[PDB]
Amino acid sequence: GMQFKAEARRNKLMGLWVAEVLGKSGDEANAYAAEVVKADFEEAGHEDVMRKVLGDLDGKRPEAEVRAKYEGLMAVAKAQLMDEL
To answer: Domain containing 7 — which CATH number?
Structure first.
């Protein structure tokens, strides 16, 4: 299945965007791009993830920007995994 490879990539990639929106850089962003991958076991779909990134953003962006970013990234995530080959 591609679910999981694609999940890890989608989840990681959003972390790097959210990190840039925080004003992280370098390795702070890479560490953060593990955190967003580490919030998807307790609840399926996109529940406990969203509250994690939103609370971490502290109001730095509107939810409408944020959730759209995540949702749109599933396409990008799966580009990268066939483009990395």
So the answer is: 1.10.790.20
Cα gap 40→21, rounded to integer Å: 21
**What is the C-alpha separation between 39 and 24, in angstroms, rounded?**
19
DSSP label of 37: G
Q: Please, which experimental method was used?
A: NMR
What domain range includes position 19? 1-85
Contacts with 35 (C-beta within 8 Å, 6 or more apart), sequence order: 15, 52, 56
Burial 6-21 (b: 16+ CB within 10 A, else e): beebbbbbbbbbbbeb
In total, how many domains does the chain have?
A: 1
Distance between the two ends of the chain, CA-based, in angstroms? 17
